[PDB]
Amino acid sequence: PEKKWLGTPIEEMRKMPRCGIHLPSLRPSASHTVTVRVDLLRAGEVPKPFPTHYKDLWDNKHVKMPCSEQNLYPVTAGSRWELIQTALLNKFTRPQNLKDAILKYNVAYSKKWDFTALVDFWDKVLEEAEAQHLYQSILPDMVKIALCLPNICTQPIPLLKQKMNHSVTMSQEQIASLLANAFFCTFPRRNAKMKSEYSSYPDINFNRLFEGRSSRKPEKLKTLFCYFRRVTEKKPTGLVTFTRQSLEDFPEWERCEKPLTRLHVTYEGTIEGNGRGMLQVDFANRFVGGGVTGAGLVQEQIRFLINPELIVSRLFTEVLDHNECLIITGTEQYSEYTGYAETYRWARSHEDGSEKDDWQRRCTEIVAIDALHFRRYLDQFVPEKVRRELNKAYCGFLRPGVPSENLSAVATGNWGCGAFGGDARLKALIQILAAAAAERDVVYFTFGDSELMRDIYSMHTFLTERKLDVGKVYKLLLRYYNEECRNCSTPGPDIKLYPFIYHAVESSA
Ligand SMILES: Nc1ncnc2c1ncn2[C@@H]1O[C@H](COP(=O)(O)O)[C@@H](O)[C@H]1O[C@H]1O[C@H](COP(=O)(O)O)[C@@H](O)[C@H]1O
Numbered sequence: 001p002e003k004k005w006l007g008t009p010i011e012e013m014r015k016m017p018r019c020g021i022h023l024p025s026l027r028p029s030a031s032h033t034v035t036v037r038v039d040l041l042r043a044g045e046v047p048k049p050f051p052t053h054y055k056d057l058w059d060n061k062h063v064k065m066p067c068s069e070q071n072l073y074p075v076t077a078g079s080r081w082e083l084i085q086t087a088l089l090n091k092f093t094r095p096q097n098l099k100d101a102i103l104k105y106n107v108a109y110s111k112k113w114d115f116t117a118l119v120d121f122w123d124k125v126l127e128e129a130e131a132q133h134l135y136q137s138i139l140p141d142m143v144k145i146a147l148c149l150p151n152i153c154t155q156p157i158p159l160l161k162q163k164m165n166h167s168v169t170m171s172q173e174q175i176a177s178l179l180a181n182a183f184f185c186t187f188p189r190r191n192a193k194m195k196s197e198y199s200s201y202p203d204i205n206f207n208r209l210f211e212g213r214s215s216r217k218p219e220k221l222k223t224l225f226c227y228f229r230r231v232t233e234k235k236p237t238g239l240v241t242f243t244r245q246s247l248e249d250f251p252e253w254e255r256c257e258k259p260l261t262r263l264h265v266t267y268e269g270t271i272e273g274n275g276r277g278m279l280q281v282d283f284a285n286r287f288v289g290g291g292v293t294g295a296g297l298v299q300e301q302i303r304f305l306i307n308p309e310l311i312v313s314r315l316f317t318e319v320l321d322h323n324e325c326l327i328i329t330g331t332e333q334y335s336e337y338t339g340y341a342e343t344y345r346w347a348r349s350h351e352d353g354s355e356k357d358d359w360q361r362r363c364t365e366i367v368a369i370d371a372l373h374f375r376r377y378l379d380q381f382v383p384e385k386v387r388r389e390l391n392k393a394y395c396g397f398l399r400p401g402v403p404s405e406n407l408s409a410v411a412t413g414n415w416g417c418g419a420f421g422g423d424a425r426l427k428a429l430i431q432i433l434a435a436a437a438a439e440r441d442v443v444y445f446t447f448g449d450s451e452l453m454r455d456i457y458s459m460h461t462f463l464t465e466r467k468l469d470v471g472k473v474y475k476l477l478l479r480y481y482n483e484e485c486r487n488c489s490t491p492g493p494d495i496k497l498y499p500f501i502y503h504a505v506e507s508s509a
Pocket of ligand 1: 028034035036037038039050051052
């Protein structure tokens with residue numbers, strides 16, 4: 001019978017906090033927005049905002065806050081925030097009470113936003129006692145933190161636009177307020193389908209969480225209400241950093257002399273569970289988070305639901321271009337789940353026991369890197385497409401300025417494979433080569449595919465023992481393309497990639 005894991009023992013891999021650099025004092029800079037009082041930051045205490053009082057910016061460089069005086073609405077043009085306050089400061093006892101509240105300042109979507117999933121969750125899924133707790137405690141507590149936004153999020157939040165290399169660090173507390181606003185659908189200019197300014201950003205308002213008849217919706221609702229109950233009952237004290245990274249220059253893949261690094265590969269375990277303290281890959285949509293409140297419930301959405309603080313990146317993160325990624329450090333896990341996609345179920349609250357770094361960020365680092373979709377299988381072997389995926393992965397893994405010995409292993413798996421069209425064996429090798437270029441080790445989860453585990457180890461062991469560096473491996477991929485793919489008249493070649501690599505090397509001088 002197969003072994004459960006192969007390669008370097010997972011305990012020998014680097015992880016946070018042990019491997020981390022000594023952090024300089026947290027401070028704002030031209031590259032780093034920081035929305036809390038760094039001099040007052042103390043372990044276990046709720047961070048205080050900077051500035052002390054609300055400052056507004058309503059422009060094309062910053063989040064358009066619902067509490068802005070420039071957020072206007074017909075009442076003559078009146079304050080939309082005053083309308084939001086009035087709508088939400090009402091008793092809810094029936095689901096239509098919450099619908100009608102949200103629609104008071106979203107009149108234009110009265111027909112377009114269905115609330116069937118909210119109604120059925122409230123009336124059918126929840127027992128009487130749980131519904132009562134929802135409407136007597138949770139929802140009013142959520143309203144309270146939502147309407148505290150201007151006192152909590154005092155500093156304008158910059159948009160992380162394409163090409164920016166920039167970080168925003170905010171408190172978990174600040175994020176809870178923003179997410180409660182998202183729940184009540186309060187963010188202006190983020191709703192219309194013919195929207196202009198924000199067409200290149202993901203959705204942020206949670207309206208689609210309430211729509212349709214999917215058996216998925218109640219599970220998303222339980223998962224998010226789990227979060228909201230936690231943060232309203234006990235205010236979180238940590239910080240979270242969101243970093244957009246965009247590289248213009250990449251390895252010379254055909255000539256790269258860096259050796260392959262260590263591999264641990266296994267068909268059991270999870271990225272979020274067994275890759276604790278490691279760089280955890282989110283198989284992202286380029287609109288980070290993808291359909292987190294929509295239909296989608298695969299690897300990304302699941303992660304955005306169990307660590308809901310990730311969802312706030314949608315407020316300010318422009319769609320990723322080919323050479324970009326989003327790095328999020330410090331999100332907390334609030335829920336546990338069982339299953340996946342159509343079998344996903346909220347299981348219970350999670351009490352996150354992760355250590356915090358010196359900026360009071362949980363030692364949990366997640367990187368969103370979007371694979372390409374391959375609607376024609378052979379497209380992915382074309383060198384341009386190999387390079388694209390190498391470069392995307394490389395960008396997700398590289399930490400400029402940071403010594404390699406201070407980098408954790410990368411915890412990843414079958415990125416963009418399955419119904420997205422990626423080839424698992426090609427994608428494994430791509431991420432192994434990108435990790436090698438970034439001088440990181442790899443922890444690879446094959447999620448039940450033991451033969452794939454075996455094949456990836458065998459290949460990695462062969463290339464390692466035969467001392468082929470990144471460039472030599474890359475050159476073999478170009479050989480496979482040129483000799484077996486370029487003129488292939490079938491959907492896939494007769495000779496597969498790993499068999500080709502073995503034969504090529506075994507045939508060589
Ligand atoms: N994220 C931040 N951005 C900008 N300044 C900050 C931040 N965090 C702390 N400071 C400031 O850096 C200083 C610490 O610098 P040292 O550690 O080197 O000494 C802090 O005192 C903070 O000062 C400002 O906040 C205060 C607001 O006061 P009221 O508006 O309520 O009157 C005011 O003093 C103002 O100057």
